[PDB]
Scaffold this active site. Structure first.
Site, PDB file in Angstrom:
ATOM      1  N   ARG A 211     -20.894 -10.009 -22.509  1.00 26.84           N
ATOM      2  CA  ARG A 211     -19.745  -9.498 -23.233  1.00 26.84           C
ATOM      3  C   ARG A 211     -20.032  -9.508 -24.734  1.00 26.84           C
ATOM      4  O   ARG A 211     -20.257 -10.558 -25.323  1.00 26.84           O
ATOM      5  CB  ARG A 211     -18.544 -10.375 -22.922  1.00 26.84           C
ATOM      6  N   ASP A 212     -20.048  -8.327 -25.340  1.00 26.69           N
ATOM      7  CA  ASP A 212     -20.058  -8.193 -26.791  1.00 26.69           C
ATOM      8  C   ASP A 212     -18.623  -8.247 -27.277  1.00 26.69           C
ATOM      9  O   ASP A 212     -17.831  -7.364 -26.962  1.00 26.69           O
ATOM     10  CB  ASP A 212     -20.655  -6.845 -27.170  1.00 26.69           C
TER      11      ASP A 212
ATOM     12  N   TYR B  39     -11.248 -11.898 -15.899  1.00 25.10           N
ATOM     13  CA  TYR B  39     -12.682 -12.116 -15.820  1.00 25.10           C
ATOM     14  C   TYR B  39     -13.219 -11.670 -14.461  1.00 25.10           C
ATOM     15  O   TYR B  39     -12.523 -11.693 -13.460  1.00 25.10           O
ATOM     16  CB  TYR B  39     -13.003 -13.605 -16.092  1.00 25.10           C
TER      17      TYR B  39
ATOM     18  N   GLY C 147     -19.111  -3.836 -29.636  1.00 26.43           N
ATOM     19  CA  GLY C 147     -19.463  -3.059 -28.463  1.00 26.43           C
ATOM     20  C   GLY C 147     -18.440  -3.063 -27.354  1.00 26.43           C
ATOM     21  O   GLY C 147     -17.909  -4.122 -26.986  1.00 26.43           O
TER      22      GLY C 147
ATOM     23  N   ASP D 241     -16.659  -2.839 -20.866  1.00 23.74           N
ATOM     24  CA  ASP D 241     -15.766  -3.800 -21.508  1.00 23.74           C
ATOM     25  C   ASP D 241     -14.295  -3.363 -21.512  1.00 23.74           C
ATOM     26  O   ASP D 241     -13.956  -2.239 -21.148  1.00 23.74           O
ATOM     27  CB  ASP D 241     -16.232  -4.104 -22.933  1.00 23.74           C
TER      28      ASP D 241
ATOM     29  N   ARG E 260      -8.096 -21.381 -14.985  1.00 18.02           N
ATOM     30  CA  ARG E 260      -8.593 -20.096 -15.466  1.00 18.02           C
ATOM     31  C   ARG E 260     -10.128 -20.128 -15.461  1.00 18.02           C
ATOM     32  O   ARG E 260     -10.738 -21.142 -15.109  1.00 18.02           O
ATOM     33  CB  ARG E 260      -8.048 -19.780 -16.863  1.00 18.02           C
TER      34      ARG E 260
ATOM     35  N   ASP F  99      -6.885 -22.565 -24.609  1.00 19.43           N
ATOM     36  CA  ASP F  99      -8.227 -22.383 -24.075  1.00 19.43           C
ATOM     37  C   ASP F  99      -9.002 -23.670 -23.884  1.00 19.43           C
ATOM     38  O   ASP F  99      -9.715 -23.792 -22.893  1.00 19.43           O
ATOM     39  CB  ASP F  99      -9.021 -21.405 -24.939  1.00 19.43           C
ATOM     40  N   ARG F 100      -8.878 -24.616 -24.822  1.00 19.81           N
ATOM     41  CA  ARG F 100      -9.578 -25.910 -24.732  1.00 19.81           C
ATOM     42  C   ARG F 100      -8.689 -27.118 -25.000  1.00 19.81           C
ATOM     43  O   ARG F 100      -8.243 -27.321 -26.125  1.00 19.81           O
ATOM     44  CB  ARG F 100     -10.767 -25.983 -25.704  1.00 19.81           C
TER      45      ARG F 100
ATOM     46  N   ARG G 159      -6.186  -5.925 -19.235  1.00 25.19           N
ATOM     47  CA  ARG G 159      -6.716  -6.469 -17.988  1.00 25.19           C
ATOM     48  C   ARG G 159      -5.801  -6.190 -16.790  1.00 25.19           C
ATOM     49  O   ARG G 159      -5.527  -7.078 -15.982  1.00 25.19           O
ATOM     50  CB  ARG G 159      -6.936  -7.974 -18.150  1.00 25.19           C
TER      51      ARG G 159
ATOM     52  N   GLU H 198     -21.837 -12.867 -25.099  1.00 27.72           N
ATOM     53  CA  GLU H 198     -21.065 -13.902 -24.461  1.00 27.72           C
ATOM     54  C   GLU H 198     -21.155 -13.886 -22.951  1.00 27.72           C
ATOM     55  O   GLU H 198     -21.774 -12.989 -22.349  1.00 27.72           O
ATOM     56  CB  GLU H 198     -19.610 -13.805 -24.867  1.00 27.72           C
ATOM     57  N   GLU H 199     -20.555 -14.934 -22.378  1.00 22.94           N
ATOM     58  CA  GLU H 199     -20.150 -15.003 -20.988  1.00 22.94           C
ATOM     59  C   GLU H 199     -20.981 -14.119 -20.109  1.00 22.94           C
ATOM     60  O   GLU H 199     -20.469 -13.194 -19.502  1.00 22.94           O
ATOM     61  CB  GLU H 199     -18.702 -14.587 -20.890  1.00 22.94           C
TER      62      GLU H 199
HETATM   63 CA   LIG Z   1     -16.243  -5.760 -26.717  1.00 25.49          CA
END
Ligand SMILES: [Ca+2]
Ligand SMILES: *[C@@H]1O[C@H](CO)[C@@H](O[C@@H]2O[C@H](CO)[C@@H](O[C@@H]3O[C@H](CO[C@H]4O[C@H](CO)[C@@H](O)[C@H](O)[C@@H]4O)[C@@H](O)[C@H](O[C@H]4O[C@H](CO)[C@@H](O)[C@H](O)[C@@H]4O)[C@@H]3O)[C@H](O)[C@H]2NC(C)=O)[C@H](O)[C@H]1NC(C)=O
Ligand SMILES: *[C@@H]1O[C@H](CO)[C@@H](O[C@@H]2O[C@H](CO)[C@@H](O[C@@H]3O[C@H](CO[C@H]4O[C@H](CO)[C@@H](O)[C@H](O)[C@@H]4O)[C@@H](O)[C@H](O[C@H]4O[C@H](CO)[C@@H](O)[C@H](O)[C@@H]4O)[C@@H]3O)[C@H](O)[C@H]2NC(C)=O)[C@H](O)[C@H]1NC(C)=O
Ligand SMILES: *[C@@H]1O[C@H](CO)[C@@H](O[C@@H]2O[C@H](CO)[C@@H](O[C@@H]3O[C@H](CO[C@H]4O[C@H](CO)[C@@H](O)[C@H](O)[C@@H]4O)[C@@H](O)[C@H](O[C@H]4O[C@H](CO)[C@@H](O)[C@H](O)[C@@H]4O)[C@@H]3O)[C@H](O)[C@H]2NC(C)=O)[C@H](O)[C@H]1NC(C)=O
Ligand SMILES: *[C@@H]1O[C@H](CO)[C@@H](O[C@@H]2O[C@H](CO)[C@@H](O[C@@H]3O[C@H](CO[C@H]4O[C@H](CO)[C@@H](O)[C@H](O)[C@@H]4O)[C@@H](O)[C@H](O[C@H]4O[C@H](CO)[C@@H](O)[C@H](O)[C@@H]4O)[C@@H]3O)[C@H](O)[C@H]2NC(C)=O)[C@H](O)[C@H]1NC(C)=O
Ligand SMILES: *[C@@H]1O[C@H](CO)[C@@H](O)[C@H](O)[C@H]1NC(C)=O
Ligand SMILES: *[C@@H]1O[C@H](CO)[C@@H](O)[C@H](O)[C@H]1NC(C)=O
Ligand SMILES: *[C@@H]1O[C@H](CO)[C@@H](O)[C@H](O)[C@H]1NC(C)=O
Ligand SMILES: *[C@@H]1O[C@H](CO)[C@@H](O)[C@H](O)[C@H]1NC(C)=O
Ligand SMILES: *[C@@H]1O[C@H](CO)[C@@H](O)[C@H](O)[C@H]1NC(C)=O
Ligand SMILES: *[C@@H]1O[C@H](CO)[C@@H](O)[C@H](O)[C@H]1NC(C)=O
Ligand SMILES: *[C@@H]1O[C@H](CO)[C@@H](O)[C@H](O)[C@H]1NC(C)=O
Ligand SMILES: *[C@@H]1O[C@H](CO)[C@@H](O)[C@H](O)[C@H]1NC(C)=O
Ligand SMILES: [Ca+2]
Ligand SMILES: [Ca+2]
Ligand SMILES: [Ca+2]
Ligand SMILES: [Ca+2]
Ligand SMILES: [Ca+2]
Lengths: 388, 388, 388, 388
Positions: free
Chosen positions: D211-212, D325, D216, D243, D37, D70-71, D290, D195-196
């Site tokens: 990315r907020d 993404y 936002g 977004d 990913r 994720d991790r 998505r 972010e990102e």
């Molecule tokens: Ca957002």
């Protein structure tokens, strides 16, 4: 690195010698091999690459069902070094259900066509980066060669067709310098229906031998002036004709300027090239289907539409074994430009029903001025035993 | 890049040291590995490559049935870097059921023979492009070395045989400059039957140690003058003889100019080279079959047909484990030319019946002027457990 | 290309930062991955390579049964670029059940030991060609580092041991220039039993931190003068000792010149290096077995056998997860020589009985002068679910 | 080799043309393909690479269960050449569950974050060697872009965030010269949650579109002065917001300096870039999830928060097919800097329940000044048929 001009004489050709085979379908019986069709060979100044249009799947793979289909979103142009079968580590060089590639002596050009049947997009990728694109002009399967384009002094040329398969269509020849479309000339001269041109340098111009899918079992010819962009067109004179379908050898006829109107509808991708006023060509042996593959020299067959005098026949693939597309590529020697050809060996649907998929392997030959013998190099896959 | 002359002395040799093994058959038990036979090693000025004749299939593959057969249309020459097993990403460098390769210091030459048993074609591929071909001259399995050719000052030489396996045949030595056959000399001197020459530079000429398949259990020798193309021939003097089959050590005899007439019929590919008037050679340990593999120095064994005085025996493969073809290759050091050998470890049919296929792995050694110990490096595959 | 001198200061080290992991065992659950043990990392002037001793098999392979064994004829040195898992296209660089590699700045050296336990052979391979070999001197498992050798001004050094595991043995330090053994010095100074040295440049000499398998749970040190070939030896002063087995932290003791005589028998490969009078080392967390792996700085731990003052502890692998061999390697920066380490994560027999095989993955860290956090990087393979 | 300055104008952009697809999930149905990913594309001065965060497993592999997470310790950054699917021979370039890479014109930088959620470590790897690392500053999932960093005159910049996903966090922009953190500036200006960041050169600075995840559905913008290290921040003016989630087209609103407070919580990685006072951006078509992916030009959409005037819409992925993404990358032409984007096509959990795993393939487009058509390039994997 310098630009390829190909400003050298065509090599002495007494026939063709064995050069490569990938056994792709036999390998796919016990390994992860891509499902492909529409392959071709093209070479940089050092070495050759095999290309093909993948179906975004390997063979022993549930996704190989229905790979009979001509255009999906998952088709990409696979590029390996020649004789390295399309394994899972093979690089997909663009998204493409129609394509054509060449090296100008400095870098690769890929011409890649994907997207909607009625609004497909042609991306032009040179030196590993996208430089241009064009839309479909006629909105009916924008398509190109399925074999190498040709670049001279750094101007690459490529034949593209949009529109009808079985009526008039709009063929254009594009000119590309460093991936940039710098001019478009439209199809001109007496060739009526043009497809899938097998093209080759012929200093100072390019020359192409195409597929008429409409009225001709003779193949079209297209001459491309790289410097002033002019275009002339005709048909391969030779009375023994190169398309499939065609009429048999005794029944057949051709014409230098016009489609013979002989079983013309449909066709198969093929190649030929001039040897003085003689012509070298190859074709499927069977006259109605893509079974077998032979090559010969028709004497005066480049300038006399009545000549049916062939010599130097070679069986490349025998008449019980399957063939398919074939195309020319050209390889610069020390003193001369040699001519080579690959031949798509198609296996699977619709012809073969033992399996649900449709792929191909290749076999490749090259012009030789030496001596050579006889043989048969078919696909060799036993479909009765393959991924059930 | 310059041409290899090999104008250096042969290295001090006190025996051979371990160099490579590919474990190809053990790997093929849980991976996609090509089915091969007739392998060899050859090296460019930097590094070595293992070659083999593929059967156009992997092992865990339905197509591996009957790979006992010597010539099919699906056989290609596989070329990897030495010690990289023939995985699915391995490059097939030509179509070939008989082959031989070398590097002149500038580029590879591949000599590739395929097509009809009675009319086979030899393609000559240099620098990734076909440059020449010849037909069979005698129309009975045109064949060559199955090990490296040798190139000096850019003239590569190769031994090729056409005709009878068990009577007189027509051996020719070809000379190739940039892939071009520039001369052919025919076999001359007292060697009666020549095959599968293991050849090596020996400035200013080449020297080959071959296989007599007819009347000799002694191996032939062929001396090739690269400059004026002359050819002399004889047999390895040494009273301990190098073919298989042969008579045992106490019963055996040789002759410098003539086949010993000792179990002569048939043979196996092998190698030897001169060390002053001594000879280094290797051979199968078993005298009738390809089980085991040893090497030794016969003292005065290069110039005295009566000598049976061996020293520096090493077991390479023990007498219960299978061997096969073996051949020489030569590697240029800083000051001297070293000599190395590979050994085909054959597994499968017809000898082993647990499986339907026929393959091989390799193990490779090199001449050393150091010290060394003892051991055994067989194939290690347990055929009782392999792809049922 | 020039020779590596490593004539630069050791980098500021405040601990170690994550660098690579190959997840080799998890990958082998759905892919063809080699069975390995005794791995290491070493780097050319551009980039790093992971090495390991293969068992001449992949994991999901019937031949992976009994890979617990330390020396078979099928063990070869696998060499990939770091972080490319040992897939079927991995190059076997020599036959070896014991090995060590380095790059002198111009080319690779491989030191490869195979053959009979009582008469093993050490081949020396530089620049892709065999240059030297030596026999076993003491006739009892000639063995070397299982981690990188070190080369300075083009003289490579390597520690080799022959003889007893649990009594006196014969350790020699060899010196190699272009693959040629140019001198042998024998083990000297107060180190009693030496194995598997993790060695590192330390201009103008090399330094090694070894494994005493006999009487010491402290690790030996060996100092190698590259110019006059002299050898001194001792033990890592630090009161917290680095072998496994060992006594716990409160019970333990060391000595700068002598084996501590503390659970000494047996051991595990490990590393350490000097930081002024402080020492950086790592070790298994569990004191009796190869479970877990930590690193720390013992203050005055390089010159004071009484010091047990550690700082900058990092868990590399937590105490429930398996470790194994670990070793140092050194990477030249712009201004300084950094120090890195890999850690063998062993899975399978004899400890784990869910499967019949024995392999390893790696995780690799590097010295950093920055800041860093905390974590745990174990093998992650669920052996309850792997190839039954 | 020289440093990339990117001191060239942004190319004419009339929309985007097809560039690559890897069909990774369809291939994983009959081959060994990594589970991934968080992918991205980035290119050296010659050619492009696809990157992704692996799950330390292949798909047809028991370890692919729960790759929803994720991790883990087994996540590494996979790096191939673009269009070579992540096969088992793919190089893992560092351990990383968050990452970002770039090429300064001389060598690669990898920014790799692994270890404890509350104390993760960021390693900085340049030219194949670790040069720096930093700890988490706020102790709550130190994370970075998941797309290319940007380097100008050899100073690479990267946005990193530590702390809350759904409240204030601590974003820092680091500056790296040859892998060395040479300065840290903290997040400044009116952007509230970052972010990102999808970042791109814009001489003399870098620009990022982030990315907020908090308040936002407009995306943040960050401007980075490479020379004096200053930082300003805001939001993409454009009234059509980028977004996901977001409010529909008629209901939506934005603001140049503040989060719109519109379904703001959560988000998805995305990209945009300025074209004069117009903005090019892409986004998921579905406003809550998505599914699907489109791109357009909002006119005055870079400087007018009221504008909802889009033109040049292209469907990249249709509204029934899954996206994920997406991020920008930049490719230097002969005269201009082109802009490209990749789009993660996510398949598996939690949305799709037919299988236990979570992966992605990619499709990639590039800015073109030519013409283009229409289409849809989804993942194409039939999850009803994949590894049960
Ligand atoms: Ca957002
Ligand atoms: C070993 O391999 C070589 C090379 O492949 C073979 O030699 C070739 O044989 C083919 C097939 O017979 C030849 O091709 C044919 O040429 C004919 C020309 O007629 C004559 O003219 C020349 C000189 O002008 C004379 O020297 C010679 O006697 C020729 O006979 C054509 O008539 C042929 O076309 C017709 O036959 C074919 C094939 O049978 C039909 O399918 C056609 O439709 C048509 O009716 C044909 O094109 C070729 O020229 C030869 N090549 C060379 C270089 O010599 C050997 O035959 C082969 N040996 C064995 C034992 O297999
Ligand atoms: C560790 O490894 C080394 C190297 O492999 C071994 O040393 C070799 O041993 C072999 C086999 O015994 C030797 O090869 C033999 O040479 C004999 C020569 O006779 C003597 O002459 C020399 C000097 O002239 C004397 O120094 C010495 O005493 C010799 O004995 C031949 O007679 C042998 O041929 C006969 O024996 C073989 C093998 O047993 C039969 O199969 C043959 O058919 C024939 O009857 C043989 O060729 C070799 O020279 C040694 N090499 C070196 C470099 O010294 C060690 O033996 C080994 N150690 C252990 C414990 O395994
Ligand atoms: C985030 O990540 C960082 C880096 O990993 C952690 O900081 C490290 O924490 C470790 C473990 O606690 C430290 O290592 C220890 O050093 C101790 C030194 O004592 C003090 O001395 C210094 C200065 O002289 C003081 O500043 C400080 O207060 C120290 O406490 C040793 O006593 C330790 O050894 C003992 O404890 C260990 C581990 O618990 C035992 O297993 C040992 O056997 C022994 O009893 C230990 O070596 C390390 O120095 C810190 N590194 C840095 C760079 O600061 C953070 O703790 C971590 N944060 C979170 C939330 O996990
Ligand atoms: C073959 O492929 C090309 C390229 O993909 C297509 O041409 C594009 O078509 C799209 C979609 O219709 C166009 O994008 C739209 O732009 C509109 C602008 O309005 C007009 O303004 C221009 C000049 O100012 C006029 O020339 C023209 O008449 C335009 O109509 C926007 O209003 C659109 O947004 C709205 O529609 C979309 C999509 O339907 C909605 O989803 C939105 O939310 C919104 O309501 C849209 O952005 C695009 O500009 C065209 N590109 C080019 C280069 O011309 C062909 O349509 C296609 N052919 C076939 C047969 O499929
Ligand atoms: C293959 O595809 C055809 C055409 O969609 C479909 O009807 C058929 O079920 C598929 N075959 C299998 C075995 O799934
Ligand atoms: C050509 O192929 C068809 C299709 O199967 C076959 O029936 C026919 O026999 C072939 N014709 C010739 C002339 O070989
Ligand atoms: C293998 O080939 C032989 C020889 O053709 C054939 O008779 C046999 O059926 C084949 N074996 C299998 C298992 O198909
Ligand atoms: C040689 O091989 C044969 C064939 O199996 C075997 O029966 C014989 O025992 C072997 N001979 C010797 C001398 O080892
Ligand atoms: C594995 O090897 C052991 C030791 O030789 C043997 O006894 C056992 O049968 C083997 N296991 C299997 C499943 O074959
Ligand atoms: C060390 O490992 C052993 C072996 O399984 C285990 O029983 C023991 O609990 C471990 N000891 C410590 C101190 O963690
Ligand atoms: C997959 O992982 C889940 C979560 O741990 C576990 O409960 C489940 O048993 C696993 N599925 C399989 C088929 O093992
Ligand atoms: C968006 O996705 C959701 C989630 O499945 C779906 O139910 C809905 O129909 C989609 N909305 C639109 C506007 O396409
Ligand atoms: Ca037609
Ligand atoms: Ca398999
Ligand atoms: Ca014989
Ligand atoms: Ca010990
Ligand atoms: Ca498989």
């Amino acid at each position: 690195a310098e630009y390829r001009n190909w400003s050298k004489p065509q090599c002495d050709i007494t026939g063709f010698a064995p050069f490569s085979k990938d056994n792709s379908i036999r390998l796919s019986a016990g390994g992860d091999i891509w499902v492909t069709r529409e392959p071709y060979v093209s070479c940089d100044p050092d070495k050759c690459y095999q290309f093909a249009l993948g179906q975004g799947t390997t063979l022993n793979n549930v996704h190989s069902n229905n790979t009979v289909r001509d255009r999906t979103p998952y088709r990409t142009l696979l590029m390996n070094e020649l004789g390295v079968p399309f394994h899972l580590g093979t690089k997909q060089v663009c998204i493409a259900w129609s394509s054509s590639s060449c090296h100008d002596g400095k870098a690769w050009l890929h011409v890649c066509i994907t997207g909607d049947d009625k609004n497909a997009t042609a991306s032009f990728i040179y030196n590993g980066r996208l430089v241009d694109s064009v839309v479909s002009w006629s909105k009916e399967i924008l398509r190109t060669q399925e074999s190498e384009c040709v670049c001279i002094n750094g101007t690459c040329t490529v034949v593209m067709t949009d529109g009808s398969a079985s009526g008039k269509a709009d063929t254009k020849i594009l000119f590309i310098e460093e991936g940039k479309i710098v001019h478009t000339s439209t199809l001109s001269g007496s060739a009526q229906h043009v497809e899938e041109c097998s093209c080759y340098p012929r200093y100072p111009g390019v020359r192409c031998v195409c597929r008429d899918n409409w009225k001709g079992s003779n193949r079209p010819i297209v001459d491309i002036n790289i410097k002033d962009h002019s275009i002339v067109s005709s048909y391969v004179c030779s009375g023994l004709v190169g398309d499939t379908p065609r009429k048999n050898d005794s029944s057949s006829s051709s014409h230098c300027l016009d489609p013979n109107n002989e079983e013309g509808g449909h066709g198969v991708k093929g190649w030929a090239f001039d040897d003085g006023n003689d012509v070298w060509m190859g074709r499927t042996i069977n006259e109605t289907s893509r079974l077998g593959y032979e090559t010969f020299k028709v004497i005066e067959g480049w300038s006399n539409p009545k000549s049916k005098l062939q010599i130097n026949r070679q069986v490349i693939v025998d008449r019980g074994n399957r063939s398919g597309y074939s195309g020319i590529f050209s390889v610069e020697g020390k003193s001369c430009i040699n001519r080579c050809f690959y031949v798509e060996l198609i296996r699977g649907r619709k012809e073969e029903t033992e399996v649900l998929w449709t792929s191909n392997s290749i076999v490749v030959f090259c012009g030789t001025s030496g001596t050579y013998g006889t043989g048969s190099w078919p696909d060799g896959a036993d479909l009765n035993l393959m991924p059930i």
